[PDB]
């Protein structure tokens, strides 16, 4: 089940500390499908808080200690029983070592203690994979969880543009954003989350998709980190997986028996998330308190309206060949409290 580490041949494309970035790959020679998964794990946004992350979360800032292999799990598993959706695909795990929500385009230098190269890491992984078989692909699914899910939204159209400009117009680029669809909502108690993104973008030289940038304009690029604002600007097909009560959303909202004020807050959050997905035709949004799903081994277990996530993704593939009989692609729970769906993870 193992994916093998390859450090980037272009060693100018680096993790935060200047060590080379890389990717883990398991090829499937009989397949023209490629799954490129972006790991998540928050971010850091100034010298002091990146230094702390370097002390105790160093694998998210450096390749120096990465293992030579990783086991593929969930959507990265090659076992049909664990991955009914894409078990025969070529599998790529791209470690998150740039701490920039995959948006950065800044090298380490005499003025920069850290490199923030997430956007460039994605493009360099794609370039190097073209020499390893990606050139023959029919579908490239850029997937990701948490900050990696936001990274999908920020980067899927740039991957599509890169392959067009390199002369590969037959590769269909698509996105799968898991747990990366956040609300810039009012907190339950008062930390300034949107301010941290704004500061981060300046620290990272962060880049956002061009059409979204042109809408919000200079200084307001932080808006494009919020799915409901950036998604309408995207041209590539994007399937959105989002728990209605995402634990990271609750964290940025300062939410941890439940009285009326908090009950109303939680119910309003789920309703707002539901509302932002009403016109997202490929989506899976269960009424659960959880965080991430697609690379979890039991990702097969959750269902919305009787349809599992692997089935919904399979129906999405069919829709991209009018709605499909018994094969839905838009699956959003309507019940208003975490675990009102009996299939929620424990
Ligand atoms: C290596 O990466 C750097 C930084 O992204 C880029 O500017 C440069 O063109 C790359 N070199 C090659 C040979 O691909
Ligand atoms: C990008 N994000 C994560 O990786 C988890 C939480 C989310 C976020 C939203 C708003 C402000 N800061 C962070």
Swiss-Prot record:
The active site is at residues 146, 246, 291. One of its GO terms (molecular function) is protein-containing complex destabilizing activity. Keywords: Glycoprotein, Hydrolase, Phosphoprotein, Secreted, Serine esterase, Signal, Wnt signaling pathway. It catalyses: [Wnt protein]-O-(9Z)-hexadecenoyl-L-serine + H2O = [Wnt protein]-L-serine + (9Z)-hexadecenoate + H(+). It comes from the Eukaryota. It is found in: Secreted. Rarely expressed in adult normal tissues. One of its GO terms (biological process) is bone development. Disulfide bonds: none annotated. Belongs to the pectinacetylesterase family. Notum subfamily. Carboxylesterase that acts as a key negative regulator of the Wnt signaling pathway by specifically mediating depalmitoleoylation of WNT proteins. Serine palmitoleoylation of WNT proteins is required for efficient binding to frizzled receptors. This is Palmitoleoyl-protein carboxylesterase NOTUM. It comes from Homo sapiens. The gene is NOTUM. The chain holds residues 87 to 451 of 496 of the full protein.
């Amino acid at each position: 089940e193992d994916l093998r580490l390859h450090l980037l041949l272009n060693t100018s494309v680096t993790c935060n500390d200047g060590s080379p970035a890389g990717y883990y790959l398991k090829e499937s020679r009989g397949s023209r499908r490629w799954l490129l998964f972006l790991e998540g794990g928050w971010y850091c946004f100034n010298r002091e808080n990146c230094d702390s992350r370097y002390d105790t979360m160093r694998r998210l800032m450096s390749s120096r200690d990465w293992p030579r292999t990783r086991t593929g799990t969930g959507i990265l598993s090659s076992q049909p029983e664990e991955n009914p959706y894409w078990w025969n695909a070529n599998m790529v795990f791209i470690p998150y070592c740039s701490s920039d929500v995959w948006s950065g385009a800044s090298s380490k230098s005499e003025k920069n203690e850290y490199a923030f190269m997430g956007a460039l890491i994605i493009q360099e992984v794609v370039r190097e994979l073209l020499g390893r078989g990606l050139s023959g692909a029919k579908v490239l699914l850029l997937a990701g969880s948490s900050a990696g899910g936001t990274g999908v939204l920020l980067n899927v159209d740039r991957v599509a543009e890169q392959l067009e400009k390199l002369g590969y117009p037959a590769i269909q680029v698509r996105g799968l954003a898991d747990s990366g669809w956040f609300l810039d909502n009012k907190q339950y108690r008062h930390c300034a989350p949107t301010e941290a993104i704004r500061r981060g973008i300046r620290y990272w030289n962060g880049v956002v998709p061009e059409r979204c940038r042109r809408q919000f304009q200079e200084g307001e690029e932080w808006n494009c980190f919020f799915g409901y604002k950036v998604y309408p600007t995207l041209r590539s097909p994007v399937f959105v997986v989002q728990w209605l009560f995402d634990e990271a959303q609750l964290t940025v909202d300062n939410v941890h028996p439940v009285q009326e004020g908090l009950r109303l807050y939680i119910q309003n959050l789920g309703r707002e998330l539901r509302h932002t997905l009403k016109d997202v035709p490929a989506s899976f949004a269960p009424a659960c308190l959880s965080h991430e799903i697609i690379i979890r081994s039991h990702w097969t277990d959750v269902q919305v309206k009787g349809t599992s996530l692997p089935r919904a993704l399979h129906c999405w593939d069919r829709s991209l060949h009018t709605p499909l009989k018994g094969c839905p692609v838009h699956l959003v729970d309507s019940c208003p409290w975490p675990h009102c769906n009996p299939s929620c993870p424990t």
